[PDB]
Amino acid sequence: MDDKELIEYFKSQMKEDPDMASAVAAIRTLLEFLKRDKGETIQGLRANLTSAIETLCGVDSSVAVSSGGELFLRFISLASLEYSDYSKCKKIMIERGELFLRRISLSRNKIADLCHTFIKDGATILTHAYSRVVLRVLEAAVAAKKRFSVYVTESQPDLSGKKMAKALCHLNVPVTVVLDAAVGYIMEKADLVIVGAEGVVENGGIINKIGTNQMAVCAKAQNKPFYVVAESFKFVRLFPLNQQDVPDKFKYKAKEEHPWVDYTAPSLITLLFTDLGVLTPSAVSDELIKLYL
Amino acid sequence: MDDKELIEYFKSQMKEDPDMASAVAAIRTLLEFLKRDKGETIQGLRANLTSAIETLCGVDSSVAVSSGGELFLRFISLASLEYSDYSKCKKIMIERGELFLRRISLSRNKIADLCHTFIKDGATILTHAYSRVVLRVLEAAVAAKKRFSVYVTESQPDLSGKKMAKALCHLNVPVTVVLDAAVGYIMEKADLVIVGAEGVVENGGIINKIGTNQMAVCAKAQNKPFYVVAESFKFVRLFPLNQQDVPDKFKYKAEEHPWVDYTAPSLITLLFTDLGVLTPSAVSDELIKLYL
Amino acid sequence: LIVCAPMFKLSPQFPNEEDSFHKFVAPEEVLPFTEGDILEKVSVHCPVFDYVPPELITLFISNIGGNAPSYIYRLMSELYHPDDHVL
Numbered sequence: 001m002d003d004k005e006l007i008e009y010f011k012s013q014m015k016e017d018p019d020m021a022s023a024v025a026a027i028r029t030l031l032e033f034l035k036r037d038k039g040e041t042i043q044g045l046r047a048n049l050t051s052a053i054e055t056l057c058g059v060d061s062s063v064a065v066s067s068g069g070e071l072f073l074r075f076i077s078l079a080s081l082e083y084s085d086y087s088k089c090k091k092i093m094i095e096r097g098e099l100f101l102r103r104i105s106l107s108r109n110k111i112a113d114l115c116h117t118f119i120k121d122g123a124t125i126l127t128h129a130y131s132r133v134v135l136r137v138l139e140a141a142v143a144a145k146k147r148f149s150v151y152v153t154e155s156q157p158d159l160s161g162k163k164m165a166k167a168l169c170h171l172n173v174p175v176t177v178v179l180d181a182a183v184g185y186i187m188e189k190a191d192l193v194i195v196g197a198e199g200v201v202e203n204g205g206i207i208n209k210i211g212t213n214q215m216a217v218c219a220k221a222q223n224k225p226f227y228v229v230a231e232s233f234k235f236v237r238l239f240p241l242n243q244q245d246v247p248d249k250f251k252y253k254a255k256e257e258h259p260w261v262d263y264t265a266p267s268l269i270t271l272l273f274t275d276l277g278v279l280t281p282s283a284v285s286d287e288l289i290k291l292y293l
Numbered sequence: 294m295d296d297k298e299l300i301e302y303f304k305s306q307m308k309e310d311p312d313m314a315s316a317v318a319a320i321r322t323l324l325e326f327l328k329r330d331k332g333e334t335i336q337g338l339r340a341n342l343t344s345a346i347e348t349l350c351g352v353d354s355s356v357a358v359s360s361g362g363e364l365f366l367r368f369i370s371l372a373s374l375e376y377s378d379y380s381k382c383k384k385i386m387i388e389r390g391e392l393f394l395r396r397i398s399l400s401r402n403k404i405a406d407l408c409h410t411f412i413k414d415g416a417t418i419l420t421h422a423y424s425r426v427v428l429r430v431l432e433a434a435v436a437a438k439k440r441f442s443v444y445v446t447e448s449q450p451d452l453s454g455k456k457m458a459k460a461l462c463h464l465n466v467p468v469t470v471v472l473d474a475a476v477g478y479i480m481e482k483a484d485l486v487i488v489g490a491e492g493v494v495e496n497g498g499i500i501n502k503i504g505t506n507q508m509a510v511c512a513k514a515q516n517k518p519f520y521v522v523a524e525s526f527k528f529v530r531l532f533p534l535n536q537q538d539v540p541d542k543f544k545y546k547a548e549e550h551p552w553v554d555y556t557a558p559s560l561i562t563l564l565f566t567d568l569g570v571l572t573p574s575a576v577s578d579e580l581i582k583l584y585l
Numbered sequence: 586l587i588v589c590a591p592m593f594k595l596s597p598q599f600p601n602e603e604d605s606f607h608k609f610v611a612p613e614e615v616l617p618f619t620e621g622d623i624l625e626k627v628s629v630h631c632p633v634f635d636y637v638p639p640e641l642i643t644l645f646i647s648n649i650g651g652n653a654p655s656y657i658y659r660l661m662s663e664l665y666h667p668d669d670h671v672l
Contacts, residue, residue, distance in 0.1 A: 118601050156449075156474060177548055180474045181449060181504035185554050188536055211474035214507055217514055243478055255444070255469045255479065262478055271599075277667070278599060282655040 001036050003055050010056065019132070022060055023068040023233055024104065029056065030072055031097050040086050049073060061254050063199035063207060063261075067236045074293060075100055107231050107275040108133055112140040115229065115273045123148045123191045129155040129209045130164040131196030133229050142171060150175045151186060155209065157258065180211065184218045193219050197230035202239045202288060204266030204281030206230070207246070210259060216268040225270045232275050235288050294329050296348050303349060312425070316361040316526055317397065319349055323365055324390050333379055342366060354542055356492035356500060360529045367585065368393050400524055400567035401426055405433040408522065408565045412439060416484045419444045422502045423453040424489030426522050428460060435464055442467045444483065448504070449473050450550075473504065480511050490523040494531045495580060497558030497573035499523070500539070503551055509560040518562045525567050528580050586643050597661055597670050600636065608633040 006029060013025045033052050039045050053069040076096050080089045111133060119125070119141050125148055127134060141148070150173060155161040161177060168175040178186050193215070199207045206212075206228060219226055240246055240263055251259040266281040276287060294302075302325060306318045326345050330338060346362040369386045376382060404426060412418070412434050418441055420427060434441075443466055448454040454470060461468045471479050486508065492500040499505075499521060512519055533539055533555050544551045558573040568579060600606070612629035639654050652660075 120603075156472060179449060179503070179550070181507070182549075182551065184507040184510060185503065185536055185551060186549075210472070210478065214474070214477035214511060217477060218507060218510055221510055221514075243481055255471050255475075258472055258475070259478065280655070280658065283658050286659070 001033065003052075006033065006052060006055065007059060010059065021064065022062055023064045026056055026065050026068055027072055027101060027104070030069065031094075031101065034097065035094065037090075042080070042089070046073075061249060063236055063250060064234050067199070068233045071233055071292075072097070072100065078293075104233065108136050110275050111229055111231075111273055112136045114278060115227075116140040116144065118192075118227070119146060119148060120191070121146055121148075124151065124189055125149070126151045126186070126190040126193050126215075127164075128153050128161075128195050128212060128215060130160040131229075133231075134194060134196055135164070135167060137194070137229065138168070138173070139171065142173065148173070151190065152177050153183065153211070154178075154180055155211070156180050160209075183215050187218050187222055187224070190219075190224060192225050192227065194227045194229065197228055197234060198261065199234050199236050200230055200272075200284060200288075201236060201263070202285060204269065204272075204284045205240070206264050206269070207250070207261050208264065210262050212264055213243075213262050216264050220268050226268060227271055227273065228269060229273045232291065235291055237288070237292070294326060299326065299345060299348060300352055303352065314357065315353060315355050316357040319358045319361055320365055320394060320397070322349065323362065324387075324394065327369075327387065327390065335382075354547055356529055356543060357527050360492070361526050364526055364584075365390070365393065371585065397526065401429050403567050404522055404524075404565055405429045407570060408520075409433040409437060411485075411520070412441060413484070414439055414441075416441045417444065417482055418442070419479070419483040419486050419508075420457075421446050421454075421488050421505060421508060422448045423457040424522070426524075427487060427489055428457075430487070430522065431461075431466070432464065435466065442469070444469050444471055444479060446471060446476065446504070447473050448502070476508055477511050480515055480517070483517065485518045485520065486512050487520045487522070490521055490527060491553065493523050493528045493564075493576060493580075494533060494555070495577065496532055497561070497576050498533070498556050499561070500543070500553050500555050503554050506554050506556055509556050513560050519560060520563055520565065521561055522565050525583070528576075528583060530580070530584070586641065587646060588642060588644070589646050591648055595657070595661065595664065597665050606634070606636065 009032060010025055010029045013028055014020070014022070030049070030052065034049070037045060037048065039048070050073075053066075053073070056069070057066055076093050078096070080093055083089065115137050127150065138150075150168060152161045152165050152168075152175060154177060165175050165177050195208065195212060195215075197206050197208055201207065216226055238247075243263060246261065246263055250261055251257075253260050266284075269281055272279050272281065272284070279287060299322060303318055303322050306321055307313070307315070323342065323345060326342070330341060332338065343366075346359075346366070349362070350359055369389045372385055372389065374382050374385065408430050420443065431443075443461060445454045445458055445461075445468065447470060458468050458470055488501065488505060488508075490499050490501055494500065509519060531540075536554060539553070539555055543553055546552050561573055564571050564573065564576065571579065610631050610633060612631050615631055616624065616627075616629050618624070642654050645652050645654065645657070
């Protein structure tokens with residue numbers, strides 16, 4: 001099928017269910033594209049898949065999409081070169097893709113189960129922007145008879161924090177909203193910091209919504225732990241050194257341009273909660289190599 | 294004059310000239326009250342002045358007003374004032390107050406002259422919020438045939454940074470406006486930080502608009518100088534330790550929305566006052582000398 | 586700073602439980618019982634163990650050699666199966 005069908009299917013899948021990330025939609029679109037092929041040679045199919053991934057990347061500019069596409073491409077073909085009939089190989093790869101899609105969807109519950117035991121009783125928690133996995137973690141924590149208070153940030157320019165505040169108020173939890181310029185003023189009362197992630201880099205740092213770097217520095221100045229929640233399919237191969245090493249195709253969405261993302265160094269992070277387990281920033285270098293088979 | 298007349302005169306003086314600070318308005322109102330007081334007593338005059346200062350501070354909650362009133366009261370009484378006649382003493386204190394008012398209006402130019410030489414050639418300067426003294430400093434610097442670039446912050450929630458940028462436009466200097474959460478991202482390109490002040494405390498720290506503490510910490514994390522411009526009549530007696538110790542009558546103006554925050558003396562490099570150029574350790578006893 | 590410790594003192598746990606992390610004993614060791622009524626409104630605490638973060642350790646001397654603190658994780662991966670982490 002052509003690119004117009006690809007874009008239409010992608011947008012329809014995104015719009016049908018709001019509780020879904022871009023990566024899952026991209027993976028489902030790629031699987032549907034795989035099921036609608038007619039070729040006879042493997043590398044022609046490889047070229048078609050690469051072109052499809054490249055076209056899909058141009059619509060939405062997020063880090064997770066490209067990494068998910070690459071992981072899907074190199075995970076689908078562990079053993080598909082044995083027989084001489086195209087049909088058997090195609091069936092085997094379709095089965096492998098279905099298995100991969102099945103295995104993708106169990107990460108959030110594992111993350112919540114591993115992370116909910118780090119919250120004390122009667123504690124104040126700071127957070128930035130909106131993230132669904134953090135909400136799941138908090139739901140699991142409140143299901144275990146614990147009490148805490150939450151501070152959130154308005155997170156300009158789209159006021160994303162108020163949405164998370166409204167979602168939190170539905171679970172009768174004390175939640176308050178502060179300004180974007182009062183983070184350092186309010187760090188005094190906090191006890192721990194939990195944020196989401198948009199991509200994990202080779203040296204252990206992260207890429208996230210603009211405004212995380214200053215919060216991390218302020219928390220480091222007063223010796224507060226910094227926790228990160230992420231997923232396996234968000235691992236990318238990149239080794240930035242400063243703020244200007246980030247590729248420009250991720251900074252500006254499709255100074256005065258207001259870049260949307262920023263990078264945080266591994267020396268300001270305490271622990272990482274992934275579906276692979278609990279890893280210090282030093283083990284990410286090995287785990288990324290092992291993952292990229 | 295009564296309380297209503299006091300408030301009317303204060304508001305009219307504030308409204309007449311936008312290029313004027315609250316302290317000068319309070320001082321002028323106090324002088325006007327002094328020139329329209331009747332009675333034969335000194336303690337009565339002192340009580341009337343104290344009540345006037347209290348009712349003036351009640352209307353507007355800014356740090357400079359109280360310090361200006363206290364300094365005025367201390368200064369106008371530093372002479373003989375023994376004699377035998379009320380009228381002679383009254384004229385003496387009126388003359389002293391007029392001399393004090395004349396002296397106050399000659400500090401911005403001195404600050405600009407002392408501070409303009411610290412700017413390099415072809416440098417990037419980061420600043421925060423709106424402040425007239427910084428504008429005067431930059432005008433003096435640009436009058437000396439120098440080139441530089443300026444970054445500003447939108448300064449939520451009233452967006453004063455845009456007004457500062459619009460004022461900077463007439464001076465044909467390159468100017469950029471960044472978000473209130475992009476300070477850490479933009480700190481790398483900067484070279485020095487210049488901010489205003491709202492009140493100087495005993496241990497050397499300052500009190501300013503919300504959002505300065507994070508800028509100071511970020512600048513300290515990358516070894517960049519931090520400069521402060523202040524005025525003599527903004528020195529107040531207070532020894533805060535953390536953010537909680539700030540008095541509540543200055544935090545919240547007349548969900549949490551504080552308006553000011555305090556910055557420690559260990560994150561500052563130099564202070565440019567009308568007394569001269571002082572390290573943070575010099576204020577601790579310059580303040581003692583000043584409050585005679 | 587140098588730590589001397591064999592291999593059977595390595596455990597696959599993270600510092601998240603606290604509470605029973607320390608070990609408290611009788612306050613008899615600190616304040617004698619012969620202090621009288623003063624021992625009716627005074628609280629005495631006698632911990633035993635203490636927690637040390639890993640940024641303050643330089644080397645580990647074991648029965649195989651010297652290793653940096655960051656290597657310990659890898660050792661665990663070859664000592665215990667991840668299934669049996671929680672009994």
